[PDB]
Amino acid sequence: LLMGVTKSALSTKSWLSAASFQNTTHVLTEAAIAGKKDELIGLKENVILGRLIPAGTGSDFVRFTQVVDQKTLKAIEEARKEA
Amino acid sequence: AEPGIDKLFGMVDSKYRLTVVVAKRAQQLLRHGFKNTVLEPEERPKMQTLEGLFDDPNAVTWAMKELLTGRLVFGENLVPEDRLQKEMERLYPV
Amino acid sequence: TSVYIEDVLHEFSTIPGVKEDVVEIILNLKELVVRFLNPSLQTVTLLLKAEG
Amino acid sequence: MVQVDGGRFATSDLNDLYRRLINRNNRLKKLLAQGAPEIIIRNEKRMLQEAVDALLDNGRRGAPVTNPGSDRPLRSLTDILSGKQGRFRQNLLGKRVDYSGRSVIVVGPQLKLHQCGLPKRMALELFKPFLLKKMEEKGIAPNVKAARRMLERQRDIKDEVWDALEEVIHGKVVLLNRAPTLHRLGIQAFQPVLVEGQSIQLHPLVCEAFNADFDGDQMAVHVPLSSFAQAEARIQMLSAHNLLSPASGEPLAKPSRDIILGL
Amino acid sequence: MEIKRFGRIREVIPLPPLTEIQVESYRRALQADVPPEKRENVGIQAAFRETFPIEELVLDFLEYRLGEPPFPQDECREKDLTYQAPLYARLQLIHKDTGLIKEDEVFLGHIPLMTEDGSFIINGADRVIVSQIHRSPGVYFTPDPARPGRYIASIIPLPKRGPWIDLEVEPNGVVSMKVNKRKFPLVLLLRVLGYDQETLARELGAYGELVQGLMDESVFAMRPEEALIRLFTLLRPGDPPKRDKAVAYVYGLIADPRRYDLGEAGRYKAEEKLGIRLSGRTLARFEDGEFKDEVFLPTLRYLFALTAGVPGHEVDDIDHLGNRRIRTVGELMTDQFRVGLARLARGVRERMLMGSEDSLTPAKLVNSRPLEAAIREFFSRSQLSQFKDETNPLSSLRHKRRISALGPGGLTRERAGFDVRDVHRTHYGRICPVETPEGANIGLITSLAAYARVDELGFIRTPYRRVVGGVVTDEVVYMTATEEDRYTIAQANTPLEGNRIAAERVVARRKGEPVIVSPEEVEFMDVSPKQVFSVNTNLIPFLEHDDANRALMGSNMQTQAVPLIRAQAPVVMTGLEERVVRDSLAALYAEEDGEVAKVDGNRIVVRYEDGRLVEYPLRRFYRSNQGTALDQRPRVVVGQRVRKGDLLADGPASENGFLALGQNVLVAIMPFDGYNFEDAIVISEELLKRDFYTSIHIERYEIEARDTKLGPERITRDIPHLSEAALRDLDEEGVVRIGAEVKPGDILVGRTSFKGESEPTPEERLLRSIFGEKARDVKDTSLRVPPGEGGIVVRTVRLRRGDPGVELKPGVREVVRVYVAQKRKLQVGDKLANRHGNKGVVAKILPVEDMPHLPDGTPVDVILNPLGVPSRMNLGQILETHLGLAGYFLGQRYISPIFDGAKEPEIKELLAQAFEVYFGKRKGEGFGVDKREVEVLRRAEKLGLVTPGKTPEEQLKELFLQGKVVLYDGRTGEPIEGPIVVGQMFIMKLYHMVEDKMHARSTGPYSLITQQPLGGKAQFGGQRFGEMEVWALEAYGAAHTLQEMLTLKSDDIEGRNAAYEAIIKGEDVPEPSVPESFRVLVKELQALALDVQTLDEKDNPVDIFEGLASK
Amino acid sequence: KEVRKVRIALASPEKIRSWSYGEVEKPETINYRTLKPERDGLFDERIFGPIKDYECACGKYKRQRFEGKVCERCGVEVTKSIVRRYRMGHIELATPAAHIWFVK
Amino acid sequence: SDPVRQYLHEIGQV
Amino acid sequence: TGRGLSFLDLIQEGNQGLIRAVEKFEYKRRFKFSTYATWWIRQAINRAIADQARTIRIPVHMVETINKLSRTARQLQQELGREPTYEEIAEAMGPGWDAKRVEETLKIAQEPVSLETPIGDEKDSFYGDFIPDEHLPSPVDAATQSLLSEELEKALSKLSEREAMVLKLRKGLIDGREHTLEEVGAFFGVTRERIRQIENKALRKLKYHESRTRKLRDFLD
Amino acid sequence: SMARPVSIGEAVGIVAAQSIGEPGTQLTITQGLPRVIEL
DNA sequence: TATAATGGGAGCTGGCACGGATG
RNA sequence: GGGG
């Protein structure tokens, strides 16, 4: 099935995105009937929520990277070896 | 351009990982008062005042230079978070 | 470098009986060429009183 | 329901819609208790439904309810939520922000690609809390409150605070933006160089990506606050780091106009 | 100095009164100087005559009168009053049963008066009523877009004066009429009018197949009464079809002159199109108890003849200026007056029932509040009533000659396509094709042509000279577009020897179409090229060499020029700069011949031939609507003999009677180290040294002290916790002294407000105990200078309660106004422009030693980059620069008229005469050619600019005739490697200045509901980070900066407070929290009976309200 | 806990009443003389919360030492005034009315 | 669709 | 119509009045029912208009007073050929009315204006968007109060624990209430004169430390 | 923008939308932006 | 608290278009 | 309404 950008954006699973796009009343009525849950997958959802978007520095791929100096790194290594 | 930005982009599989590493290292340096640095006294970034050369207050420049040195280790799941925090506070108290 | 006109509070004033506004009078005073004969003299206050 | 500057009162239209609803509801209750005929009760119930519709989505069905002596439809909840002026597009997907300024731009040919000319007073206001902290570190002020009370009056501003502001902005960058923001290069990160005067100095090579010229264009300035925001700006958003178009892959910051002419 | 004017075209007539479109309109609307018995049924008279008599007791209207203004114009501007005249109306209440008559003159309020220049003073602010273009009422015939071989007939009355009626021939064959979105067979309405099958068959039968579609047996079978009841049932379903109700409704819909009003222009257009005569301005009449047709049958006949292809019938161009008309100040004011009068009439009719049906006067019957409300509404809040643009005199002169398709009763922005915004061929000589706004409003807002005037019917007319045989008379005829389409009109530049056409072939227009025509076929001729363009466009010299898109910007930017303290007229003028200062009553002139008795900075006293001594006071340092200073300077001396119409005083931005929007500067066209990159401009510090482009600006500040339930606000010098350094320039009463310098932070008016009741926090309790000082009852609410503003206090106005002559709005004890002025020197970021569309911001001010200079040591003033010329195709500035060089060395100015000005050979001659002074002076002073000049001449003959072998003087003269000179770089002393164009150019300083537009904000005010920062520099607001800026930050992948924008820097209360504290404490900014606008969204969705629940990974509810909204 | 999802659904009359801190029984806003909120009106402090932080209407309890207390004289809870942006009211209809979103 | 017209029609039935 | 209530609301309140008239009608008086009904219907309509037409509800007698003021001002404007002054309206109102009372009545009669009132000819801005929030503390005020608390604790640490605790208990920094001298004396077990003496000496030490360091002066505003 | 493999986490859809929309005001014998929208 | 009084009243958003649904 |  091929649909234009407007209908495809309105038909997305996230109801926050579709409601912030257009046809707010229609989208909100159908989502409230369905008891829809927005999983905050896209960007507009987290932007509305004021969250950290899942892209760039907020991507789960790079978000949990740690930095440590070799002095402290070796100190932690010796502390974990003696346990 | 930032000095050595091409080599910094060569160190990582993703530029945003470089950004995360630099930001977290700058936060470490700010929290521990720069005394956890891997830099030598002659490698310390400097700032020209009316008095003279002083230490560069910008922790991001510090972190980028430290990363260029190669004495920093970055990655995922290197150490539990609480253990890292407490060992850093033991080696460099507030 | 400075001007004070009696019964004039600011540059945007206007003197009764005078055709030029204070702005134009100061513009004319900017064209004044004053030569100091004594090299040790760094400031002078010229006075002017006219009527009729 | 708030009292403005001159003691006058300003209130939302939702209050008038709620008043309509409550008046009609209480009148319906009183008509029911007093045993009114079915015609009166039917009219009252229909008016109650009309009032509920007016409260939720005015103008949706029937003529929109207006305030007396006015053709302006009252703003219902639906009107608050949807539309270009609605809650989503006006206060959720975009906001007015702190630590931001705006000024007319000027060509700064002496600037390096990673630099921008920033007026002194704009920088003093944008970095004001950092400047208070620096004025407390140096002996310029006893504490932050005195530093702010000193910055409040312009004639109380001495020359040491300018050196302190120079110390504050060291290494940091700011975000320059020009509307319309058609692509991601409508915002760029620049190291600020403090300048006298009230104009922002823009590097020539980036004028193509901003679609900016100097026939009166203005730009907005923003201050990334955190170490994380500063790192994002210096690494990913810096002007000197984005030299190719993300659309075509070709160079975007390239010689043009006078540079091409001279070469 | 000498003024040389070019051109051979002789204009037989001068420009009309440029503000007559406002003045004559309002004078015809009011008819105040006409004795009441001799007035015409127009304007206010027509409104009174339409509203009365009020039938129900009968109240009838006799006459009206206008009194004198209670206050003059200056006092109205001072005291926030409306310049108005009292309106009285003599009404006699008649009891048609008794014969009793009670006559009285009732007061109907005040009506605003138009000043001499054509503007109004509403609540103290100058305002302009812009004329509105719209479709002229009448009967039009347009092609049906769906069915090609059919058409639609449109009956259009005046706006709000009845519905539009559409006649159509449906596919089934019957003729339908469309009114109020309902459609019915026209045959029924024809039967109500009294038509029978015989009459229609004999009248329309010539057009074969359509009359049978008109035939319906059931309608002809019933008499007009049954047909009227049937039509009422069709138009008003559910309404019981009482016969009197049907009569009343159909009469009010079609025949009522009070509810349906075709235009007088509409009546004339109907009579001209259909070839009939109207007894009134309604579509039918109610006569002798029945309905009599007026308009419907002729329109139906014309429609059937057009469908059948009968010759002599045409479709109507609705954008043709014969079908589009102007509603001026008088007509709009009269419309709103009529609405208010109808409301007063409804009030009167309601009063004629209640109360005592016997004891009633016209004073007891009339309540004038609706009329006053309608007039005040029109003048205060209408879209066509605009804040007067008085930046310079030309600003307001053009503002009064504006034409809007917008406004009430007209187009919306989406309702405007390409057809409306287009330049119609009939705009020739009527609507300027150049002067129109750039952007969304293009084509909607236009300007009136110079020689154009709007007739009494509302159609713009342009003048043409009569041509009989081959002779051009001096008589002029003002034609509409419809009448213009009849003749063959020759161009104004057609060659003439005397009054005879000297060309074998002339260029002419037939219905706007260009054609070559013999002098025998010439019926009329253009008066002047000036008639084609507006006033602003006529001030652009060498307009024929500029592209239209940039001449537009030149016209629109002459409006934005700031009056300079040393303003001067351009060296190259068009001939209109005097007339513009004349008709824009900024300058002062002598009434009759006489002698000047007294010349002062404040007044000019003249003794005329009559012996009477007339004193003219001069407006000195008055603040306009836009802050520009409006001041008059005297241009005569004591004892000077003046004539009738001689200049006495120069207004703002005028030099010896000529329009002075800017300054003539020595400009060099060359790049310069990238400082003029992309339209930027480099200027010389010598401009600031001799105070060029320096302007005076005044800003008005205001503060009120009012009665509060907590105690009075007091304007006092006693302000708590303030030093004497802060209160230095304040007088005893707390107002800043006249002449003091005020900077950002300084106090203008001190004021104390009684503190709102509040329990001092325990920390405040301990502080009070430590210092042992009582907390004062009042709080500092003093008016201070905003950031980036300030200057010299020139005036102070204070109005208290209980002093003679002044009464404030309820609750306000006193009001104080402080006037602060400032002398603004040109600086980096201010905007400059010429009359040709070249505009640029000042990017660099160099010291005089770095400036490129001539061999004789004269440095240039402005450096313009030549890259802004080729793409823009505006060569008029180049010719202006050449002629300005010529006039700079000859010491003279020029008048180059539009499309008939100085051409290249004359400019070459003037340039040779100037080169003589420029070089023979040097040669006589004992100096030969310079070495660098020789190297430049070498590189120039390499460029083919000069002829090889000639002497250095001859080659320099060739270059000078090309408008180029040798230019030395002040940095090196070495010359520029080529000859460079240098000359005098007229450049203006525009209203856009960096001092007004610079702004920044750390933290500040927030909005009530959203808790997001406010907007605007005046409110110390923050910059909007819209959706597209969020898109930019997202595409960069800067997640934390975006989150800062969405939280810490806006509407995250906890987040922003903690961020400010952490920054002033040197700590890193904290983790952001939930934006308050999201909580607002959640609660507004709950008010819509929708449960929005934030959940965790376990689908358990998460409380973002933190227990505050849950019981 | 961290927010990971957002659910939207229809609200029963029972849920609407469970949101409400009281029923708005009057069309009054604020008193014309005192400018204080009218009781049982659209701005009543007994329903939506206190105008000032940790202070009841009549002023019997005026500090955080009483929080969660409901003044017996004026009937206002002593909490932060920010709750006036959060706490909901309700109107009990004599006759059910259709939500127009689910109609038009 | 017009509440007042509907109410007047209902009034006219008595 | 046009008094602040919609036509249907007036109809319904008139129906209420009609119900009252049906309940109070006495057919023995031979008066037709319309006579007695019209009075009650006008009464109910005017009562409803007086009660509901204003967002800020005003009692019925005050509404009558304001309407009488309007009628008097209109009479004076029709006879004077211009709008009257406060004093002229006070004169035409008779005894008990001065210009101050007329002004106060007109001020009380002022109706509120809509926050959504448009600004400009575009639909892009509202009036309430130019209205600041004066209630919620700005970040500057919150930071100032926090710094005040911190400097107060810094200055109280220069006392002994007991003499700083006396001040904290007496001025309300602890528990929020200001304890009397008897209560602080009974808490520290000492006599009220003794606790007053140690309070005075602690205040003396604080004033001395203040004159020495000049720390808490800037918070005096 | 870098002439190298894209980094994981780059908001690619936003970049696509901006790259397609930015020259929209330049689209003019030619169908142009109406055709682009039709597609 | 009583003469009789018995179906409103604006005059829309009317020179845009285009398309996605439901009748 | 004005500006880019």
Next chain:
DNA sequence: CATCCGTGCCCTGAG
């Protein structure tokens, strides 16, 4: 084939 609904550039602005 009609009819109703809902979209239709961004930032600034200022009496």
